[PDB]
Write a protein that holds these residues in place. Structure first.
Motif, mmCIF file in Angstrom:
data_model
loop_
_atom_site.group_PDB
_atom_site.id
_atom_site.type_symbol
_atom_site.label_atom_id
_atom_site.label_comp_id
_atom_site.label_asym_id
_atom_site.label_seq_id
_atom_site.Cartn_x
_atom_site.Cartn_y
_atom_site.Cartn_z
ATOM 1 N N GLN A 48 10.034 -0.897 -46.298
ATOM 2 C CA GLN A 48 10.826 -2.118 -46.422
ATOM 3 C C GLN A 48 9.860 -3.295 -46.509
ATOM 4 N N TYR A 49 8.724 -3.277 -45.758
ATOM 5 C CA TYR A 49 7.587 -4.174 -45.781
ATOM 6 C C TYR A 49 8.000 -5.610 -45.605
ATOM 7 N N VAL A 50 8.320 -5.885 -44.351
ATOM 8 C CA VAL A 50 8.489 -7.230 -43.890
ATOM 9 C C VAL A 50 6.984 -7.502 -43.715
ATOM 10 N N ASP A 51 6.294 -6.690 -42.889
ATOM 11 C CA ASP A 51 4.821 -6.690 -42.616
ATOM 12 C C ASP A 51 4.012 -7.896 -42.086
ATOM 13 N N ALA A 52 4.445 -9.149 -42.319
ATOM 14 C CA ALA A 52 3.842 -10.349 -41.765
ATOM 15 C C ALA A 52 3.700 -10.080 -40.294
ATOM 16 N N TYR A 102 6.046 -0.293 -37.427
ATOM 17 C CA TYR A 102 4.667 -0.269 -36.952
ATOM 18 C C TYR A 102 4.207 -1.703 -36.744
ATOM 19 N N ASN A 103 3.631 -1.911 -35.509
ATOM 20 C CA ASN A 103 2.971 -3.074 -34.917
ATOM 21 C C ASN A 103 1.529 -3.138 -35.373
ATOM 22 N N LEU A 104 1.151 -4.193 -36.080
ATOM 23 C CA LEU A 104 -0.226 -4.310 -36.502
ATOM 24 C C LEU A 104 -0.966 -5.165 -35.467
ATOM 25 N N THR A 105 -2.094 -4.679 -34.949
ATOM 26 C CA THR A 105 -2.862 -5.448 -33.979
ATOM 27 C C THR A 105 -3.779 -6.385 -34.744
ATOM 28 N N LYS A 106 -3.427 -7.669 -34.788
ATOM 29 C CA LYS A 106 -4.249 -8.644 -35.483
ATOM 30 C C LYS A 106 -5.346 -9.148 -34.563
ATOM 31 N N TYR A 107 -6.053 -10.214 -34.974
ATOM 32 C CA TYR A 107 -7.409 -10.566 -34.541
ATOM 33 C C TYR A 107 -7.568 -10.623 -33.034
ATOM 34 N N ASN A 120 -9.065 -5.397 -36.024
ATOM 35 C CA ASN A 120 -8.054 -6.002 -36.873
ATOM 36 C C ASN A 120 -7.512 -4.933 -37.806
ATOM 37 N N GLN A 121 -6.201 -4.894 -37.971
ATOM 38 C CA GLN A 121 -5.568 -3.943 -38.861
ATOM 39 C C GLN A 121 -4.916 -4.672 -40.022
ATOM 40 N N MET A 122 -5.078 -4.125 -41.220
ATOM 41 C CA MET A 122 -4.530 -4.710 -42.425
ATOM 42 C C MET A 122 -3.749 -3.658 -43.188
ATOM 43 N N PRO A 123 -2.568 -3.991 -43.693
ATOM 44 C CA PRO A 123 -1.751 -2.999 -44.394
ATOM 45 C C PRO A 123 -2.375 -2.647 -45.729
ATOM 46 N N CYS A 124 -2.472 -1.351 -46.016
ATOM 47 C CA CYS A 124 -3.006 -0.893 -47.286
ATOM 48 C C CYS A 124 -1.940 -0.248 -48.157
ATOM 49 N N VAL A 125 -0.668 -0.446 -47.839
ATOM 50 C CA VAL A 125 0.412 0.021 -48.695
ATOM 51 C C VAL A 125 1.243 -1.181 -49.105
ATOM 52 N N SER A 126 1.782 -1.125 -50.310
ATOM 53 C CA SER A 126 2.533 -2.241 -50.854
ATOM 54 C C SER A 126 3.991 -2.117 -50.441
ATOM 55 N N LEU A 127 4.865 -2.877 -51.078
ATOM 56 C CA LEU A 127 6.284 -2.801 -50.796
ATOM 57 C C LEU A 127 6.938 -1.804 -51.741
ATOM 58 N N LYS A 152 0.643 -15.196 -41.876
ATOM 59 C CA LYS A 152 1.755 -15.988 -42.385
ATOM 60 C C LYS A 152 2.994 -15.171 -42.711
ATOM 61 N N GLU A 153 4.129 -15.858 -42.791
ATOM 62 C CA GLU A 153 5.407 -15.212 -43.078
ATOM 63 C C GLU A 153 5.604 -14.893 -44.571
ATOM 64 N N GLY A 154 5.978 -13.653 -44.899
ATOM 65 C CA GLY A 154 6.231 -13.274 -46.276
ATOM 66 C C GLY A 154 5.065 -12.945 -47.196
ATOM 67 N N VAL A 155 3.808 -12.832 -46.737
ATOM 68 C CA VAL A 155 2.677 -12.538 -47.682
ATOM 69 C C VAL A 155 1.875 -11.222 -47.451
ATOM 70 N N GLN A 156 1.039 -10.768 -48.415
ATOM 71 C CA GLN A 156 0.225 -9.543 -48.161
ATOM 72 C C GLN A 156 -1.105 -9.766 -47.640
ATOM 73 N N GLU A 157 -1.818 -10.576 -48.382
ATOM 74 C CA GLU A 157 -3.122 -10.798 -48.024
ATOM 75 C C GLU A 157 -2.963 -11.662 -46.819
ATOM 76 N N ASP A 158 -3.870 -11.453 -45.871
ATOM 77 C CA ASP A 158 -4.008 -12.361 -44.747
ATOM 78 C C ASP A 158 -4.743 -13.624 -45.181
ATOM 79 N N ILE A 159 -4.905 -14.565 -44.245
ATOM 80 C CA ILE A 159 -5.380 -15.895 -44.608
ATOM 81 C C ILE A 159 -6.867 -15.885 -44.929
ATOM 82 N N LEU A 160 -7.635 -14.999 -44.309
ATOM 83 C CA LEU A 160 -9.018 -14.826 -44.734
ATOM 84 C C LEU A 160 -9.104 -14.206 -46.128
ATOM 85 N N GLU A 161 -8.179 -13.300 -46.453
ATOM 86 C CA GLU A 161 -8.129 -12.751 -47.802
ATOM 87 C C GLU A 161 -7.748 -13.816 -48.820
ATOM 88 N N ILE A 162 -6.843 -14.718 -48.444
ATOM 89 C CA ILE A 162 -6.449 -15.806 -49.329
ATOM 90 C C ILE A 162 -7.611 -16.758 -49.542
#
Ligand SMILES: [Mg+2]
Lengths: 209, 229, 50, 83, 230, 228
Positions: free
Chosen positions: B28-32, B54-59, B69-76, E66-76
């Motif tokens: 569904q990729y809300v993902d933010a 799934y909860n992504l652990t950011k910085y 830091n975790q970053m999603p590698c799958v698209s929507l 940020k809300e609604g995006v893929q790349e994070d802000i460092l990627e942007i």
RNA sequence: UUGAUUUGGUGAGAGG
């Protein structure tokens, strides 16, 4: 509190912790002459705070000592000329951390470095047993005037060119430079300019270039 | 790594730094905030209709001050299977294991700058930020009641002039995110009767810079400054 | 297989390319090795030691 | 300028007394009252001392002669100022 | 003194970015001299515009999300540091990017002014996934040379700017790759002449004959210190 | 977008044929540009004249030997190559020297015309053992640029010269050695700059700064076409 | 007269 490796003799009376001293990772800098070493600007402004204070108070830029400590806490545009005028003829003792013989404490003249790493002349490395795989060295400042003269007249790196254990030179060229010489002074049975005649070494280098 | 051994996959999965999918399906990729995976029906329970979030652990801070830091590698709208990876952790690239980076290296002596074991690096390595790592430092400030009353969290920092009240609120503690360096003030934390007042206000250590990424406060039931609590 | 893979790409088989010098613009004699090594940055950073 | 002190070691042949003679001289120039016997190229008192040593005009004997001359000058100054 | 002078005879554009250029005729031995000198100058000292300050709304520091995006802000910020802009009149402009809806955010979505030209209409920046998500960033494009980084530009900046403006490093040089070749010239009466085939690879923003003219003026005005004074 | 112009701070004139042009400060990575460009031009492009061919009696090739001399004809060829001559009006002048008697033959002993002159008359040519020995050589002087050696000279020639003509390397360019360093200077904020130290040693016939100025105006007139 | 606490000690890991 007396005996042992951590008593008063072996831990506080034979070896002491020392002001006007610094420590950082070493790197090469092959442009140096072998009486001088590179020393960073941040370490140079920290190790030479009282000399800079004395120089600032002599010119008349400031008045009280506080003003000078605010000036070098802010690091204005005029204290770097003060720093190049306190460095100039003032040797420092570089020291690699496992000092085994006397060639492991040698005195250099600083040349200031944009950076955070001590640039150390390569030939001198064979005295310190210092490669550049993550090594660290300590700098010490001879404060008094007899100590500056002992650093220049006994402990200068130009004065230690023979190892005291024997007669063999300790400023022997180590590894890159002997490859450059062994490739330079050699021969092959045919090349460009085989068996031509040259009126001097100057046009030998002119024919090579 | 261009020259790997193929054991990068097993190490990057089996160490739990990547968000390996529990149940397969779509997305569904809300993902933010979180990866939202719709589950295919065969792997899906009859009750508990169920989609996996799934909860992504950011910085955040690692044990060695590095940045996990975790970053999603799958698209929507993209199929994933059970056991597949979804979010790349620190030092991972699409489920593989990327500790360092691969660079064009010449073997030669170059004018003495790589003498014993030294390494001579172009400016294209430092322009691209291709080693520019991110370190995170936790700094604590407490205002314990040692003696002569309790200590205090106020901006009304003394002796020091309008070089205290700056990266903070209108009346206390580092605001949120600026480019703080060394000698700054983060948490005004000084007592009276300690002229006779003093400066224990936890500041920034000498030589470091940075951005305040997070401020935590489970303080002595009362911290509220004006009415922020 | 390294040589055969270097022949699939259009690279020289020896692994070694002739390289010029950026300072002088003139060729290094005796061709040098260029390739891609996976180099890592260890956490012994110099502005934690200075 | 200065790289090696070898000629100064030649003219004061002990290599341990060079430091003492040049330190006595550089204290005569630093606090010091005195002015150097040699042109200075913005060198410090260390290098000016050793540079005076190399050309053979300062050793231990010259410094003791100059201090006896200053002691006699202070003696004559005290006697001619009082009496 | 039996010397000659060279001219730019044929300027072929292989693409919009990668483009060669000849030089004809050069004297004997001068080919590697002019080629290496123009290489060093054309790689070090060319002026090109780049992204310097990025201002996103509702984002405090660059390590957030940020809300609604893929790349994070460092990627942007990295994908914005790769941008290739070509202004004409001013030396400091402010663009605007506003976009909502599901789909990727190209560089062609920036609401351009008249004197700015974005030469990469397929440069991706964001991947907006929520249809209720929006993004409104305001970029600032200066113009300089060399490499000036965020640490040095942390106190160098005089114009007291407000807090909330993310600082992006400045990669100003629009030349990325340059190679020269000294062929044999086809001169109808001379055999001892050569041509210089400079093979540039630009950022798309710089015009190659203009770049060669500017590098030549830089070299001539540097050598005037040798010519006039001694 | 403004560049740093330098000041030429020093000409430490060691001898009349020696210089050291200390020069500061330049942009980062420009000292190597200026130094390498000047070095290649001064080596292989600077115009001038010297001895190319010489016809000597008593010899038939480069490995014979005339009487009355300590040195041999390779040594007379080398000491001839070391001679620095300047020609003003023309560009192909043949000179002839004849010497007899106990004593060395020097450069002042030659017969000169109105257009040519010797910049070092005490430069030795040979020495003579016999007072009855009469040496004679027909010294031709062309004018080219740079350096061309006798090896590729004899590879490039094809016309059959008369027996007794000797080829020598044509040191046309008047400089003997140029080699620089790049040091690091400091303008009060930026330490990244760099200072040039050009060393130069020539023969006679020129002053090292004149050679530097000549090479610089050669390159400037070469690049004079496509500038603004 | 204009300001303050680790060294102390243990354990574990790391660099040269
Ligand atoms: Mg080691």
């Amino acid at each position: 509190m007396i005996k042992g490796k951590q008593g008063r003799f072996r831990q506080n009376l034979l070896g002491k912790r020392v002001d006007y001293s610094g420590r950082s990772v070493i790197t090469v800098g092959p442009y140096l002459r072998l009486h001088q070493c590179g020393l960073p600007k941040k370490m140079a402004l920290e190790l030479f705070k009282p000399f800079i204070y004395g120089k600032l108070e002599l010119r008349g830029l400031a008045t009280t000592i506080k003003a000078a400590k605010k000036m070098v806490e802010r690091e204005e545009a005029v204290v770097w000329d003060i720093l190049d005028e306190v460095i100039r003829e003032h040797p420092v003792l570089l020291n690699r951390a496992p000092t085994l013989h006397r060639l492991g404490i040698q005195a250099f003249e600083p040349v200031l470095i944009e950076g955070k790493a001590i640039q150390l002349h390569p030939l001198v490395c064979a005295a310190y047993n210092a490669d550049f795989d993550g090594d660290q060295m300590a700098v010490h400042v001879p404060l008094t005037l007899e100590a500056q003269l002992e650093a220049r007249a006994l402990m200068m790196s130009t004065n230690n060119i023979l190892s005291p254990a024997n007669g063999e030179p300790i400023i022997v060229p180590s590894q890159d430079v002997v490859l450059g010489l062994y490739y330079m002074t050699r021969d092959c049975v045919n090349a460009k300019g085989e068996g031509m005649v040259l009126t001097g070494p100057k046009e030998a280098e002119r024919l090579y270039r | 790594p261009l020259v790997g051994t193929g054991m990068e996959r097993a190490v990057a999965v089996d160490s739990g730094v990547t968000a390996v999918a529990k149940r397969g399906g779509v997305v569904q990729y809300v993902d933010a905030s979180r990866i939202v995976i719709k589950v295919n029906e065969d792997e899906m329970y009859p009750g508990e209709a169920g989609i996996d979030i799934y909860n992504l652990t950011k910085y955040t801070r690692s044990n060695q001050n590095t940045c996990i830091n975790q970053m999603p590698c799958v698209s929507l709208g993209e199929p994933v299977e059970r056991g597949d990876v979804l979010a790349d952790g620190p030092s991972t690239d699409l489920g593989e294991l990327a500790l360092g980076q691969n660079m064009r290296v010449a073997f030669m002596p170059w004018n003495g700058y790589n003498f014993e074991d030294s390494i001579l690096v172009s400016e294209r390595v430092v322009q691209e930020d291709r080693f520019t790592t991110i370190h995170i430092q936790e700094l604590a400030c407490v205002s314990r009641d040692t003696k002569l009353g309790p200590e205090e969290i106020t901006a009304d920092i003394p002796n020091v002039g309008e070089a205290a009240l700056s990266k903070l609120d209108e009346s206390g503690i580092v605001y949120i995110g600026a480019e703080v360096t060394g000698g700054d003030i983060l948490v005004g934390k000084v007592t009276p009767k300690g002229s006779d007042v003093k400066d224990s206000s936890l500041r920034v250590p000498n030589g470091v810079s940075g951005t305040v990424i997070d401020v935590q406060v489970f303080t002595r039931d009362g911290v509220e400054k004006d009415k922020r609590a | 297989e390294i040589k055969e893979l270097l022949k699939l790409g259009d690279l020289p088989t020896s692994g070694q390319i002739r390289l010029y010098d950026g300072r002088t613009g003139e060729q290094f004699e005796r061709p040098v090795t260029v390739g891609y090594m996976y180099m890592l940055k260890l956490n012994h950073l110099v502005d934690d030691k200075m | 300028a200065r790289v090696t002190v070898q000629d100064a070691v030649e003219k004061i042949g002990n290599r341990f007394d060079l430091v003492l003679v040049a330190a006595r001289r550089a204290r005569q120039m630093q606090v010091g009252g005195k002015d150097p016997l040699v042109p200075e190229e913005n060198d410090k008192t260390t290098v000016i001392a050793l540079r005076e040593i190399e050309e053979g005009l300062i050793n231990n004997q010259i410094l003791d002669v100059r201090e006896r001359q200053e002691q006699q000058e202070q003696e004559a100054a005290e006697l001619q100022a009082v009496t | 003194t039996e010397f000659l002078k060279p001219r730019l005879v044929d300027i072929e554009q292989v693409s919009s970015t990668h483009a060669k250029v000849t030089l004809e005729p050069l004297e004997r031995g001068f080919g590697h001299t002019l080629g290496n000198a123009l290489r060093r100058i054309l790689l070090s000292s060319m002026p090109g515009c780049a992204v310097t300050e990025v201002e996103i709304d509702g984002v405090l520091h660059e390590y957030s999300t940020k809300e609604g995006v893929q790349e994070d802000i460092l990627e942007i910020l990295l994908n914005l540091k790769g941008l290739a802009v070509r202004v004409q009149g001013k030396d400091e402009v402010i663009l605007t990017l506003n976009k909502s809806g599901i789909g990727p955010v190209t560089a062609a979505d920036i609401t351009h002014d008249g004197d700015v030209e974005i030469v990469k209409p397929q440069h991706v920046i964001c991947h907006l996934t929520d249809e209720n998500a929006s993004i409104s960033m305001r970029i600032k494009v200066q113009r300089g040379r060399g490499y000036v980084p965020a640490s040095t530009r942390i106190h160098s900046e005089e114009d007291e700017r407000p807090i909330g403006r993310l600082l992006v490093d400045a990669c100003y040089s629009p030349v990325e790759r340059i190679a020269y070749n000294v062929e044999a010239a086809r001169v109808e009466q001379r055999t001892d002449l050569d041509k210089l085939v400079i093979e540039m690879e630009t950022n798309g923003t710089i015009d190659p004959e203009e770049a060669i003219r500017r590098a030549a003026t830089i070299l001539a005005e540097q050598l005037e210190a040798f010519v006039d004074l001694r």
